[PDB]
Design a protein around this motif. Structure first.
Motif, PDB file in Angstrom:
ATOM      1  N   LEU A 152       0.817  -1.214   0.000  1.00 29.56           N
ATOM      2  CA  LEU A 152       0.000   0.000   0.000  1.00 29.56           C
ATOM      3  C   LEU A 152       0.851   1.264   0.000  1.00 29.56           C
ATOM      4  O   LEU A 152       0.546   2.230  -0.707  1.00 29.56           O
ATOM      5  CB  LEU A 152      -0.940  -0.006   1.207  1.00 29.56           C
TER       6      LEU A 152
ATOM      7  N   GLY B 236      -8.436 -10.392  -7.022  1.00 31.01           N
ATOM      8  CA  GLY B 236      -9.657 -10.295  -6.257  1.00 31.01           C
ATOM      9  C   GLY B 236      -9.895 -11.430  -5.289  1.00 31.01           C
ATOM     10  O   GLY B 236     -10.841 -11.358  -4.498  1.00 31.01           O
TER      11      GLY B 236
ATOM     12  N   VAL C 296      -1.521  -6.513   1.601  1.00 28.96           N
ATOM     13  CA  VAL C 296      -2.176  -5.661   2.585  1.00 28.96           C
ATOM     14  C   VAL C 296      -1.867  -6.216   3.967  1.00 28.96           C
ATOM     15  O   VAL C 296      -1.749  -7.430   4.153  1.00 28.96           O
ATOM     16  CB  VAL C 296      -3.701  -5.583   2.356  1.00 28.96           C
TER      17      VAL C 296
ATOM     18  N   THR D 174      -7.251   6.380  26.939  1.00 24.86           N
ATOM     19  CA  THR D 174      -7.698   5.005  26.738  1.00 24.86           C
ATOM     20  C   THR D 174      -6.515   4.078  26.484  1.00 24.86           C
ATOM     21  O   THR D 174      -6.387   3.030  27.126  1.00 24.86           O
ATOM     22  CB  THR D 174      -8.697   4.932  25.587  1.00 24.86           C
TER      23      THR D 174
ATOM     24  N   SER E 101      -5.578   0.934  29.443  1.00 28.02           N
ATOM     25  CA  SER E 101      -5.626  -0.475  29.054  1.00 28.02           C
ATOM     26  C   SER E 101      -4.230  -0.975  28.685  1.00 28.02           C
ATOM     27  O   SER E 101      -3.984  -1.481  27.591  1.00 28.02           O
ATOM     28  CB  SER E 101      -6.607  -0.672  27.905  1.00 28.02           C
TER      29      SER E 101
ATOM     30  N   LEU F  78     -13.927  -6.549  -7.770  1.00 29.88           N
ATOM     31  CA  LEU F  78     -12.850  -7.279  -8.428  1.00 29.88           C
ATOM     32  C   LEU F  78     -12.023  -6.361  -9.315  1.00 29.88           C
ATOM     33  O   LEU F  78     -10.799  -6.511  -9.396  1.00 29.88           O
ATOM     34  CB  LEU F  78     -13.419  -8.426  -9.259  1.00 29.88           C
TER      35      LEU F  78
ATOM     36  N   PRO G 206      -7.284  -3.640  -4.562  1.00 30.23           N
ATOM     37  CA  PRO G 206      -7.573  -4.170  -3.226  1.00 30.23           C
ATOM     38  C   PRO G 206      -6.801  -3.465  -2.125  1.00 30.23           C
ATOM     39  O   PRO G 206      -6.224  -4.114  -1.249  1.00 30.23           O
ATOM     40  CB  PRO G 206      -7.165  -5.641  -3.349  1.00 30.23           C
ATOM     41  N   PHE G 207      -6.788  -2.134  -2.158  1.00 32.13           N
ATOM     42  CA  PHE G 207      -6.245  -1.328  -1.069  1.00 32.13           C
ATOM     43  C   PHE G 207      -7.332  -0.446  -0.482  1.00 32.13           C
ATOM     44  O   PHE G 207      -7.538  -0.442   0.734  1.00 32.13           O
ATOM     45  CB  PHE G 207      -5.057  -0.493  -1.549  1.00 32.13           C
TER      46      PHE G 207
ATOM     47  N   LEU H 174     -10.678  -2.758   0.661  1.00 33.56           N
ATOM     48  CA  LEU H 174     -10.590  -3.700   1.767  1.00 33.56           C
ATOM     49  C   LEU H 174     -10.349  -3.006   3.103  1.00 33.56           C
ATOM     50  O   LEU H 174      -9.738  -3.586   4.004  1.00 33.56           O
ATOM     51  CB  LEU H 174      -9.498  -4.732   1.504  1.00 33.56           C
TER      52      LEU H 174
ATOM     53  N   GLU I 202     -11.419  -1.865   6.785  1.00 35.19           N
ATOM     54  CA  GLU I 202     -12.059  -2.761   7.736  1.00 35.19           C
ATOM     55  C   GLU I 202     -13.403  -2.259   8.241  1.00 35.19           C
ATOM     56  O   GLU I 202     -14.183  -3.059   8.767  1.00 35.19           O
ATOM     57  CB  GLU I 202     -11.132  -3.010   8.930  1.00 35.19           C
TER      58      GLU I 202
ATOM     59  N   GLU J 182     -11.624  -3.283  18.829  1.00 31.47           N
ATOM     60  CA  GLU J 182     -11.387  -4.655  18.414  1.00 31.47           C
ATOM     61  C   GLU J 182     -12.076  -5.602  19.392  1.00 31.47           C
ATOM     62  O   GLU J 182     -12.800  -5.182  20.297  1.00 31.47           O
ATOM     63  CB  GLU J 182      -9.893  -4.944  18.334  1.00 31.47           C
TER      64      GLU J 182
ATOM     65  N   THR K 211      -8.758  -3.145  22.360  1.00 28.49           N
ATOM     66  CA  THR K 211      -8.312  -1.762  22.419  1.00 28.49           C
ATOM     67  C   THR K 211      -9.086  -0.902  21.429  1.00 28.49           C
ATOM     68  O   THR K 211      -9.433  -1.351  20.334  1.00 28.49           O
ATOM     69  CB  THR K 211      -6.818  -1.676  22.119  1.00 28.49           C
ATOM     70  N   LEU K 212      -9.354   0.342  21.822  1.00 32.00           N
ATOM     71  CA  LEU K 212     -10.081   1.260  20.956  1.00 32.00           C
ATOM     72  C   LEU K 212      -9.287   1.536  19.688  1.00 32.00           C
ATOM     73  O   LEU K 212      -8.079   1.781  19.734  1.00 32.00           O
ATOM     74  CB  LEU K 212     -10.362   2.571  21.688  1.00 32.00           C
TER      75      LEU K 212
ATOM     76  N   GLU L  75     -19.781 -16.453 -10.065  1.00 34.69           N
ATOM     77  CA  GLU L  75     -18.836 -16.336  -8.964  1.00 34.69           C
ATOM     78  C   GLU L  75     -19.590 -16.304  -7.644  1.00 34.69           C
ATOM     79  O   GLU L  75     -20.591 -15.596  -7.508  1.00 34.69           O
ATOM     80  CB  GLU L  75     -17.982 -15.077  -9.106  1.00 34.69           C
TER      81      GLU L  75
ATOM     82  N   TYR M 169     -18.261 -15.843  -4.185  1.00 31.73           N
ATOM     83  CA  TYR M 169     -17.861 -14.886  -3.166  1.00 31.73           C
ATOM     84  C   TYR M 169     -17.058 -13.756  -3.791  1.00 31.73           C
ATOM     85  O   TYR M 169     -16.282 -13.975  -4.726  1.00 31.73           O
ATOM     86  CB  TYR M 169     -17.041 -15.566  -2.068  1.00 31.73           C
ATOM     87  N   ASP M 170     -17.245 -12.551  -3.265  1.00 37.94           N
ATOM     88  CA  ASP M 170     -16.540 -11.373  -3.744  1.00 37.94           C
ATOM     89  C   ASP M 170     -15.233 -11.203  -2.973  1.00 37.94           C
ATOM     90  O   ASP M 170     -14.785 -12.101  -2.256  1.00 37.94           O
ATOM     91  CB  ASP M 170     -17.437 -10.144  -3.632  1.00 37.94           C
ATOM     92  N   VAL M 171     -14.603 -10.036  -3.124  1.00 39.22           N
ATOM     93  CA  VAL M 171     -13.340  -9.773  -2.440  1.00 39.22           C
ATOM     94  C   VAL M 171     -13.543  -9.769  -0.930  1.00 39.22           C
ATOM     95  O   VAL M 171     -12.832 -10.458  -0.190  1.00 39.22           O
ATOM     96  CB  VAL M 171     -12.736  -8.444  -2.925  1.00 39.22           C
ATOM     97  N   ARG M 172     -14.533  -8.967  -0.467  1.00 36.44           N
ATOM     98  CA  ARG M 172     -14.794  -8.892   0.967  1.00 36.44           C
ATOM     99  C   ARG M 172     -15.098 -10.278   1.548  1.00 36.44           C
ATOM    100  O   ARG M 172     -14.588 -10.625   2.616  1.00 36.44           O
ATOM    101  CB  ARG M 172     -15.949  -7.925   1.244  1.00 36.44           C
TER     102      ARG M 172
END
Lengths: 75, 106, 94, 395, 315, 106
Positions: free
Chosen positions: A8, A47, A70, C89, C93, D4, D8-9, D12, D14, D282, D287-288, D370, D372-375
């Motif tokens: 990246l 992909g 990534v 925070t 923690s 696709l 993929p930067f 993807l 989160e 998470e 952790t925040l 297809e 499933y996708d990338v996610r």
């Protein structure tokens, strides 16, 4: 043969591999070249996420291919 | 082994120092254990926010050393860093270029 | 000789992460040091005054937040309080 | 597809990072619920008005009950059917109304009660599970012909386990988790119970793979456990994993939510005054990691959509609906087949040649799809389409 | 291999030369040095900055770069040997060619490739020789370069003049108004960082001169590998009497040969491909199979011509 | 197509040398008062308070900084007053109005 791993951050690394190498061997090669532990990374090509157990040749990767690295970033 | 209290929070500014200053500066009878951390975070945020503009100025002026004139520029050119420092005078900072419009020739 | 203290090395560690190649002068370093001291005194004094009106006997991480939100102007307040709460925070923690 | 092809930067990421749109509802919103896929948004307005916006236009597409049988007062639950056809809702009018979205003029079926409702939940067949106000037992309404049956303080929230739809979970008004085994039609014996707090449980969410669970106590804490089931639906245990809270001003929580399958992220909405933000932690380390910072008012409800990967939340003071979605910027690099964009000056290496001027039969499958996708979202699932009503279009 | 640190290298069409204190000269104070050594060697003034060092190379990451021989081959018959991912090139080039570009990228130089011994000119490759014998790491490549007598080149130039005066022209009048045997050089003394060098103007690329293409009379380039010739590289060598110096014609219009015209043996280095060139008969290996003089003789001749012209040009 | 780039007697009427001094001073950052006269002025003013003080060499300098950053700022305000009265000169009745409005006289 050479493949590319595009990070990246703007860096592309030109790894040297053989088609008979496993993906685990590829993660090991990325580590021993750059020091990133294989557990923390994540490799993507066309992909589809490359599955942990299978091999490079399973994905029909040939020389000078590019693929995206990534990071499973955390705290 | 020891582990600096300002490294557990991702800060650069010292937290033990700020805590000792809060304790021995006679601000209150008791100092919460997380107040120095919060205050040090705010301090480093402000100093980074001003040092960034100072570096931008010193670079857009083709130098590579932040110098009082660059801090004066970085402050007085902003709009909110100007209210935080509306009363101060930055030694060797000069003044901002400005000429009224009634004075410019026609 | 007697050793006096300052914020020189910490301002330098912050400069070397905001602009990884620039370098500060000396008078500019003293200016940044007195700036840090002045803002420290402003914030701690307002926090004390505020932890006095309410008759509390302590100056906690919320007196500091309200002080920061009073003294700092419109938008600097939001970013300052965000950085502060993130640091607190990440510290509690650990 | 459209993913696709994307790089993929920026696709993807989160979780959402910025708010994009802010729907304005004329009434006041009270419940949000996407369709099983990110297609429709079923809003429950202030006075029983129930609209179904479409995510491609953000403007209404169908108002169920326009003929009759609509709701009259604040709605409290909106549950979709896994296919997309049927839609269950419940309001403070004591009534539970199931609508067939192929004829949305009138309610298909409905039942009435003796107390306001907290929430209805789907099971398949056709049988819902409901929690009534002030009561101490849940209700199984297997209403293909409208029958109703019944099954530590009270019962506030219910939820069925994802992997084993026979398991049922319920939280009490006094701190008790109670589990149930739907081993029959209308007779269910508990399999496990316990008491973890002294205050009311307010939410019971569970990851899509039964490997996590979260709980919002009336105490300003969030208890996250790692549940597991076994033994023909008899083995059941809990292991405390984490506790989250607001260390600065001890605010309370209004709603909580997980990520899609492994639940690697927990999203919560704060409740006190001066509280306008969503927290995102998470779950492994706890952790925040993020604070969504878009709105300007206390945020009540939350909903995540994993196909479009957007977070939706309704304001409290105004009644609007803000959307935080992943944003992908347009890449000029696409305008040609070989236009690779860089960020920094790359160096150039040249072979000695450059100064010196001067059948196919590959595998092709056009009918295969297809999965499933990338996610990692499952395509090919049945996506029923709400039929457009033309009567309200001529005017 | 070491680089130069404080020498002015040939660039922007300027050539430098070291000088030493000569008190016989009154108008000028200095005269040309022999060299930093007795024999001819690698000319340090006209090298690329990236060209490191009778031995020359570039690091393994550097594009094509070149060096020229100091001696300017005007006419006659001269033989020598050049001793040999890392490629190199051996050839000959005029002054107009850039030290940044591989010999044979322009129309002013002709060269040969290390791999496949292909001949390179005008940026195009040639496989005139059918032998196709590969070159190894220790081979010695001979060059016999034969050029016409000065008088015939002079008359060819005079023919070019007689065409140009009116046939190609029919401020025209000034151009029509505009010495072949006589040499006139331009030299200024300069001091660069406490060091002392002479500055001289150089030639620029222009449109190729045409009429049949201009060819030096009975000019020939012959190449040998370990005694075996591999053919004639070129015949129709360009005349140079054809070679316009950089000139601010605007200046003189508004107000209104330097003994160095010829082809230089040039060595090119790519990604570390080293080599060395041999000049002196004692270390010449195939001087008798021609049957002649070595390059070092012409080196001494150029030294004599330069010093004598320096003598006369004082007054 | 070609490669783009970034590079390839007298008597001024009254009012122009002023508009040039303004631009050359609003960009400089040095001190605009001689140092020895200000030294002596500070020492002479401090007689009325205590006879023989020693005025550490950074004190004096300090004062000078403030003494500029005050006057300069003052002039800015007075300028506006002048421009407000539909003129270009600044008169003593402008300084007095600035100091009155600003609070220094009341």
């Amino acid at each position: 043969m050479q493949i590319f791993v595009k990070t990246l951050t703007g860096k592309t690394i030109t790894l040297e591999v053989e088609p008979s190498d496993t993906i685990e061997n590829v993660k090991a090669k990325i580590q021993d070249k750059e020091g990133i532990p294989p557990d923390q990374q994540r490799l993507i090509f066309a992909g589809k996420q490359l599955e942990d157990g299978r091999t490079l040749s399973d994905y029909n990767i040939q020389k000078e291919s590019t693929l995206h690295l990534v990071l499973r970033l955390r705290g | 082994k020891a582990k600096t209290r300002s490294s557990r929070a991702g800060l650069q500014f010292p937290v033990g120092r700020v805590h000792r200053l809060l304790r021995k500066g006679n601000y209150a009878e008791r100092v919460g254990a997380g107040a120095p951390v919060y205050l040090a975070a705010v301090l480093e945020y402000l100093t980074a926010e001003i040092l960034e503009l100072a570096g931008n100025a010193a670079r857009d002026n083709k130098k590579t050393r932040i110098i009082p004139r660059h801090l004066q520029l970085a402050v007085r050119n902003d709009e909110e860093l100007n209210k935080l420092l509306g009363r101060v005078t930055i030694a060797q900072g000069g003044v901002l270029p400005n000429i009224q419009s009634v004075l410019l020739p026609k | 000789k007697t050793r006096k203290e300052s914020y020189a090395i910490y301002v330098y560690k912050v400069l070397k992460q905001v602009h990884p190649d620039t370098g500060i002068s000396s008078k500019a370093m003293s200016i940044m040091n007195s700036f840090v001291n002045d803002v420290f005194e402003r914030i701690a004094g307002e926090a004390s005054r505020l932890a006095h009106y309410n008759k509390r006997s302590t100056i906690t991480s919320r007196e500091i937040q309200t002080a920061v939100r009073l003294l700092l102007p419109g938008e600097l307040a939001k970013h300052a309080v965000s950085e502060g709460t993130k640091a607190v925070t990440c510290y509690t923690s650990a | 597809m459209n993913i696709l092809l994307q790089d993929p930067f920026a696709v993807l990421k989160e979780h959402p990072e910025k708010l994009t749109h802010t729907i304005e509802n004329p009434l006041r919103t009270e419940c949000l619920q996407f369709s099983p896929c990110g297609d429709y948004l079923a809003l429950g307005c202030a006075n029983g008005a129930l609209v179904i916006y479409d995510m491609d236009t953000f403007r209404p597409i169908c108002v169920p009950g326009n003929m009759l049988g609509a709701h009259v007062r604040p709605i409290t639950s909106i549950a979709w059917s896994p296919d997309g056809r049927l839609l269950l809702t419940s309001s403070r009018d004591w009534s539970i109304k199931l609508w067939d979205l192929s004829k949305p003029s009138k309610p298909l079926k409905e039942i009435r009660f003796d107390s306001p409702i907290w929430g209805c939940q789907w099971l398949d067949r056709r049988l819902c599970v409901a929690t009534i106000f002030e009561e101490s037992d849940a209700y199984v309404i297997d209403f293909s012909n409208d029958p109703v049956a019944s099954l530590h303080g009270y019962v506030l929230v219910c939820t069925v386990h994802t992997k084993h739809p026979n398991i049922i979970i319920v939280g009490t008004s006094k701190g008790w988790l109670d589990f149930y085994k739907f081993h029959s039609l209308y007779q269910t014996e508990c399999i496990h119970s316990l008491k973890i707090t002294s205050s009311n449980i307010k939410h019971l969410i569970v990851s899509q793979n039964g490997e996590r669970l979260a709980i919002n106590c009336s105490d300003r804490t969030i208890r996250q456990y790692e549940i597991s089931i076994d033994d023909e639906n008899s083995a059941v245990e809990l292991t405390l994993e984490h506790k989250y809270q607001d260390v600065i001003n001890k605010l309370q929580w209004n709603c909580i939510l997980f990520s899609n399958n492994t639940a690697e992220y927990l999203v919560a909405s704060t409740h006190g005054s001066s509280a306008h933000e969503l927290y995102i932690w998470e779950t492994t380390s706890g952790t925040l990691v993020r604070v969504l910072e878009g709105a300007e008012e206390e945020l009540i409800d939350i909903n995540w959509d994993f196909y479009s990967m957007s977070i939706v939340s309704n304001g409290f003071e105004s009644g609007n609906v803000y959307v935080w979605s992943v944003v992908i910027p347009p890449k000029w690099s696409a305008l040609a087949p070989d236009f690779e964009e860089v960020e920094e000056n790359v160096d150039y290496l040249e072979k000695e040649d450059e100064f010196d001027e001067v059948e196919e039969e590959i595998a092709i499958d056009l009918r295969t799809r297809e999965q499933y996708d990338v996610r990692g979202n499952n395509l090919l699932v049945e996506r029923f389409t709400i039929p457009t009503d033309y009567t309200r279009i001529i005017k | 291999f070491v680089r130069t640190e404080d020498i002015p290298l040939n660039r922007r069409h300027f050539v430098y030369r070291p000088c030493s204190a000569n008190p016989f000269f009154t108008i000028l104070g200095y005269g040309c040095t022999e060299y930093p050594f007795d024999h001819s060697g690698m000319s340090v003034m006209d090298r690329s900055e990236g060209l490191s060092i009778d031995l020359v190379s570039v690091p393994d990451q550097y594009g094509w770069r070149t060096a020229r021989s100091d001696v300017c081959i005007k006419e006659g018959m001269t033989y020598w040997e050049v001793e040999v991912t890392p490629h190199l090139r051996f050839g000959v080039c005029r002054r107009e060619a850039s030290l940044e570009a591989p010999v044979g990228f322009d129309v002013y130089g002709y060269g040969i490739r290390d791999i496949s011994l292909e001949s390179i000119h005008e940026g195009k490759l040639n496989c005139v020789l059918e032998n196709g014998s590969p070159l190894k790491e220790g081979d010695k490549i001979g060059f016999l370069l034969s050029l016409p007598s000065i008088h015939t080149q002079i008359k060819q130039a005079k023919e070019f003049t007689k065409r140009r005066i009116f046939a190609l022209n029919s401020n025209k009048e000034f151009q029509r108004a505009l010495e072949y045997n006589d040499v006139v050089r331009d030299q200024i003394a300069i001091r660069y960082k406490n060091q002392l060098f002479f500055e001289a103007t150089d030639y620029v690329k222009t449109t190729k001169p045409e009429y049949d293409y201009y060819q030096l009379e009975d000019s020939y380039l012959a190449i040998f590998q370990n005694g075996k010739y591999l053919g004639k590289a070129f015949e129709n060598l360009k005349p140079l009497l054809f070679s316009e110096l950089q000139y601010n014609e605007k200046f003189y219009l508004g107000y209104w040969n330097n003994n160095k015209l010829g082809y230089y043996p040039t060595i090119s280095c790519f990604n570390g491909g080293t080599a060395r060139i041999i000049s002196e008969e004692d270390k010449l290996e195939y001087l008798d199979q021609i049957r002649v003089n070595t390059l070092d003789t012409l080196y001494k001749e150029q030294i004599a011509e330069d010093i004598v012209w320096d003598i006369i040009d004082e007054l | 197509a070609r490669t783009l780039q970034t590079a390839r007697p007298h008597r001024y009427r009254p009012g122009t040398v002023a508009l040039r001094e303004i631009r050359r001073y609003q960009k400089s950052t040095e001190l605009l008062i001689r140092k020895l006269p200000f030294q002596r002025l500070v020492r002479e003013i401090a007689q009325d308070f205590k006879t023989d003080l020693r005025f550490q060499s950074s004190a004096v300098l300090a004062l000078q900084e403030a003494s500029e950053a005050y006057l300069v700022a003052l002039f800015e305000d007075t300028n506006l007053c002048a421009i407000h009265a539909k003129r270009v000169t600044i008169l003593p009745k402008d300084i007095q109005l600035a100091r009155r409005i600003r609070g220094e006289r009341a």
